[PDB]
Amino acid sequence: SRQLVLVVVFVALLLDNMLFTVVVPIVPTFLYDMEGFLEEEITRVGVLFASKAVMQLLVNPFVGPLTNRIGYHIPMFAGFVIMFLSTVMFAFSGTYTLLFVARTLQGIGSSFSSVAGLGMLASVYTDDHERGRAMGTALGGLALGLLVGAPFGSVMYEFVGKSAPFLILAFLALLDGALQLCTPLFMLLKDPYILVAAGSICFANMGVAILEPTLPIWMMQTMCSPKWQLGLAFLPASVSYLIGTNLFGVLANKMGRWLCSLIGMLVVGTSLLCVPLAHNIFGLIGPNAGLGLAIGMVDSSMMPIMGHLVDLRHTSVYGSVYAIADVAFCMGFAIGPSTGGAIVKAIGFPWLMVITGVINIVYAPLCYYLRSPPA
Amino acid sequence: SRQLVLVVVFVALLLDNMLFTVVVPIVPTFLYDEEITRVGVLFASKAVMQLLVNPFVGPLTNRIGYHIPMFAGFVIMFLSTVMFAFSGTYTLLFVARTLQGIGSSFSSVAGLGMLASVYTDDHERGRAMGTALGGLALGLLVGAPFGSVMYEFVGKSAPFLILAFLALLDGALQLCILQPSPESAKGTPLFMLLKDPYILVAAGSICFANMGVAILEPTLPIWMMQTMCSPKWQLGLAFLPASVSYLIGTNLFGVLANKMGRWLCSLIGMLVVGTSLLCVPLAHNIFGLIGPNAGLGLAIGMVDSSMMPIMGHLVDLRHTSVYGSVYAIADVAFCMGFAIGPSTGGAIVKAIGFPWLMVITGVINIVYAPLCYYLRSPPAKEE
Ligand SMILES: COC(=O)[C@H]1[C@H]2C[C@@H]3c4[nH]c5cc(OC)ccc5c4CCN3C[C@H]2C[C@@H](OC(=O)c2cc(OC)c(OC)c(OC)c2)[C@@H]1OC
Ligand SMILES: C[n+]1ccc(-c2ccccc2)cc1
């Protein structure tokens, strides 16, 4: 029924965020277990983190005609089985080579699910009013999974073993399988307005993209924190992000969207600058919460601007914003860690954070162009 | 004793900067007895001459102390207000402005040097200069309506005579406490302190912020008349929130700078002033400028109170303990924006436009802020 498909889509997006948010606090300690020596492996961890983004980009434009030719349910099956396989090898992987294949399979399955589930939700809901509510429910489940995934793997690593969280995620995925069993984008990427908005979103999310694969190694090398607080350190970045996106989605229309994006990028730069100063775990709640709140600001201010820009000058569909918005996230999560590993090899982590903050601040006042576009 | 020195510097900045703003609503109306180009140069006469006298006042403080320059500044300010009280021609109204500029430069450099000298603790030093900037903001806020009501109700010679009497009282207080009747440490030459990157960053920060309230003030009434079509009684009232927010910001952030962080304070102030300048030209009425002007004044007070004690902190960290030249550089940074702004702002507005000028200033401040992170912890000199 209509509630069943929404439930399975919500659970699928939940697991999709759970896997990506549980990989981040496990892989560096996983490499530490078999063996300061992460300065040489930071590049390989950056490539392993950018593999999913690069695979999602390479398989992005192929699922379009595939869903039209063979329907929407069939591409669901491939994505779910591939993500089940990626989960099962991730709990069972022992070497660096298997992790890359697991990440590529996870990226392909994430792309297939993100296409097929939203396509099904659009197809089922033809009432023209409940579709937006279902999309909001899916986004809320996405945020809930983002919140839950970060403390999960770090807490259940040194306490209940290593394969426990991945096996639990695979078992939860098996539950959803039984429930489920019963103006193109290249034409929209030539005007300056949409390109500026996409660049703003990408440069806003690149900070949290670079914070993932390079922060735990810095924490282990300097702060001497235990192995269970590494996943807890990212909790403010999720909680503050959720409160910020709710509040500023409420409040952004009053004080202007372009000012929202400008102030959000500025506070992103300031938070990233203030991040590498703390010498204890308690010095990271401020900057991380600020960065999450700022990313909520920039996303909630840039999505309606993208929608209005597409509507005013071009003809749009139910999911025009999803194609462009997922492009900016893919550039962010693909160009963040791969370049960040080489940057940390050549120069220090604080220099990388200063560079990211400087880029965000310098790109900040280019959002003046987006105020009142013409026709 | 050390508490009374702050009272002397507080009074000195109050009287000198009150004369700066009292003559504003008296000169263009009484001069009448094309025009903007010359009347505008008269308002900028103090800034041009004060910038020149700063390099000749800095090294002078190392050889004769901080008392004689302050007494000379008081005497020059009294002479300037006396000359303003009786002059009634365009030629005689320029020498008085030049004398007021010389006295203002002398008083500012001597007072800041003395305040740096007496107060040694950095956290303690961050409050005296905050209250001094608050007194300066109070003088700039109260000079305009006092002189306006005095001219409108009692005459042209009334407020200048009252300011002269207040200057006499201030000089009597100065003779009472300071007794203006050579430093052991030989301070570094001024040319060497212009090579330290931190000093240049701080001076550029103060100079850029002081370029925003400057290039906004003379060119704002013209755009208001051209677009909003407002009556004559709102042009003065538009800039009042900037002064009020400047006073509040300078006091509170002189309190808060030692706690929250000097470099973060300067960076947030620069970002706020840049965004305020960006959002200024979007207003479609007088009520659209209440917010951006208040943010601009608060951010400028933030930057000023953050970058005042940092100069003395750097001078103690690296160079010898002599504070005259660094605050001479600070006054040069303060006066450069005020001497460049009024004389050319109409030219830039006629050439490219007021919104483009605001966007350029805004963008220079937003695209300059991340350079401040360098003042987090300068390395010390070799032992
Ligand atoms: C990895 O998972 C993601 O990439 C999601 C998030 C990325 C990023 C992030 N990762 C973290 C990991 C942490 O632990 C280490 C801690 C903090 C963070 C933060 C804080 C900040 N944060 C933002 C998250 C945003 C999510 O995207 C959407 O919410 C979304 C919403 C829509 O509706 C408006 C869309 O349609 C238009 C849409 O389509 C493109 C996507 C995005 O993809 C689903
Ligand atoms: C030296 N100085 C003069 C004027 C100001 C000022 C700033 C904002 C609003 C009004 C005055 C600040 C400093």
- The CATH number linked to A123 is 1.20.1250.20
My answer on whether B117 and B55 are in the same domain is yes
Tell me the residues of chain B between 302 and 331 that have a Cβ less than 8 Å away from chain A.
none
d(CA B94, CA A59): 75
Distance from CA of A150 to the nearest CA of B (A): 30
My answer on whether B221 and B348 are in the same domain is yes
d(CA B24, CA B157): 14
Would you call B268 exposed, middle or buried from its count of C-beta atoms within 10 A (0-12, 13-18, 19+)?
Answer: buried
Q: Let me know how long chain A is.
A: 375
DSSP string over B300-346: HHHHHHHHHHHHHHHHHHTS-S--HHHHHHHHHHHHHHHHHHHHHHH
My answer on whether B103 and B230 are in the same domain is no
DSSP string over A116-166: HHHHHHHHH--SSSHHHHHHHHHHHHHHHHHHHHHHHHHHTTTTT-SHHHH
Minimum Cα–Cα distance from A263: chain B residue: B275
d(CA A3, CA A130): 11
Whether B275 has its CB under 8 Å from any CB of chain A: the answer is yes
Would you call B34 exposed, middle or buried from its count of C-beta atoms within 10 A (0-12, 13-18, 19+)?
Answer: exposed
My answer on whether B134 and B167 are in the same domain is yes
d(CA B19, CA B102): 13
My answer on whether A164 and A31 are in the same domain is yes
Among candidates A87, A67, A75, A163, which has minimal Cα distance to A113? A75
Ligand 1 pocket residues where CB is under 6 Å: A 17, 20-21, 24, 139, 142, 146, 150, 205, 208, 212, 234, 237-238, 241, 292, 295, 303, 321-322, 325-326, 329
Question: Where is the domain boundary, A132, A160, A182?
Answer: A182
Range of the domain at B102: 1-183
Question: Where is the domain boundary, B154, B183, B212?
Answer: B183
Chain B residues whose CB is inside 8 A of the A365 CB are: 274, 278, 362-363, 366-367
Minimum Cα–Cα distance from A271: chain B residue: B264
For tokens 């509510």, name the residue: A133
Among candidates B232, B38, B11, B31, which has minimal Cα distance to B151? B31
My answer on whether A242 and A299 are in the same domain is yes
CB atoms inside a 10 Å sphere around CB B259: 9
Give the number of C-alpha atoms closer than 13 A to the C-alpha of residue B94, restricted to the C-beta side.
11
Cβ atoms of residues A236 and A256 within 8 Å: no
My answer on whether A320 and A252 are in the same domain is yes
Three-class SS of residue B43?
A: helix
Question: Where is the domain boundary, A182, A210, A232?
Answer: A182
Give the containing element (helix H, strand E) for B7.
helix B2-22
CA dihedral sign of residues B347, B353, B358, B362:
negative
A362 and B367: CB-CB below 8 Å? yes
A259 and B267: CB-CB below 8 Å? no
My answer on whether B214 and B307 are in the same domain is yes
In single-letter form, the type of residue at position B138 comes to: L
Query: What was the resolution (in A) of this experimentally determined structure?
Result: 3.6
Experimental technique for the deposited model? cryo-EM
Q: How far is CA A240 from CA A74, A145, A233, B43, B89, in A?
A: 38, 15, 13, 50, 64
Cβ atoms of residues B274 and B365 within 8 Å: yes
In single-letter form, the type of residue at position A269 comes to: G
Residue B39: phi and psi, rounded to 5, are -55, -35
My answer on whether B87 and B172 are in the same domain is yes
My answer on whether A192 and A177 are in the same domain is no
d(CA B278, CA B35): 30
DSSP string over B164-225: HHHHHHHHHHHHHHT-----SS-PPPHHHHTS-HHHHHHHHHHHHHHHHHHHHTTTHHHHII
For tokens 């407002």, name the residue: B230
Q: How far is CA A266 from CA A272, B29, B184, B305, in A?
A: 10, 44, 47, 22
Q: What is the DSSP letter of B382?
A: P
Helices B262-279 and B290-317: angle between axes, nearest 10 degrees: 150
Among candidates B109, B147, B135, which has minimal Cα distance to B20? B147
Cα A359 to ligand 1 centroid, rounded to whole Å:
21
Count: domains in chain A? 2
Q: Cα angle at B184 between B180 and B189, to 5 degrees?
A: 100
Cβ atoms of residues B277 and B365 within 8 Å: yes
Tokens of B70: 């302050």
Minimum Cα–Cα distance from B362: chain A residue: A365
For tokens 């987090």, name the residue: B376
My answer on whether A149 and A57 are in the same domain is yes
Cβ atoms of residues B296 and B212 within 8 Å: yes
d(CA A347, CA A191): 36
My answer on whether A176 and A197 are in the same domain is no
